[PDB]
């Protein structure tokens, strides 16, 4: 399948070269998979989600996304126009308030929620969780991410936006999950992207168009935007049967575009997520 005039990041993930604008992908499109977006919520009524999104948990007075960040990330996972895996099921877990903040204890509870809640959902092709959040190093936060991964969920986490080594941030620094840095449309490391040996992969993160609250759209930047490209890619590849939740990060690294990014510090992987789809 071909989506013309796609957002640059979608085109990038199906291309061996920057500078194109059509996204190519297998029509299975993540059908039968599920992606949890652990964030500020999801505006599930947005026409872009086509009834495939729903809120399953909140720790606050509402499950609605009063911020936009979670809706934007969910759109990159699975919206019809802005999403990688256009037929996946999206489940929102609101661990962040409408200012985008959340206590680590709430975030940990949300991860353990997903590890159990997947047993209440129909996801025959597998389960992914996208975590566009983080703060300073915490062994408890890393352990919660490790448990979620161990339970059979492909965990993708943002590297962070500090232009610093991600070893000092959580859950970015947890070895067993997939830690995602950000790149721009010219294949440069995004100016804010964290780096370091703990990164597994880069995805598009600068000037990413996606859904927003109020039934709208906007372009924003962050490792928060790169993470859902990788989460959606995992769901898509799991639906194709090419990999599993336990092996998808490694498979994405195996099949990535290699050596094509600029300003990658010595010791950080030079790997850009790629779907290897042959139309």
Swiss-Prot record:
GO MF, one example: metal ion binding
Cofactor names: Ca(2+)
One Gene Ontology term from the biological process aspect of the record: proteolysis
Annotated catalytic residues: 39, 69, 224
Reactions listed under catalytic activity: Hydrolysis of keratin, and of other proteins with subtilisin-like specificity. Hydrolyzes peptide amides
Stretches assigned to the Peptidase S8 domain: 7-279
Protein name as catalogued: Proteinase K
This protein's encoding gene: PROK
Sites where the protein binds Ca(2+) 2: 16, 260
Disulphides: 34-123, 178-249
Residue window of the full protein shown: 106 to 384 of 384
Residues reported to bind Ca(2+) 1: 175, 177, 200
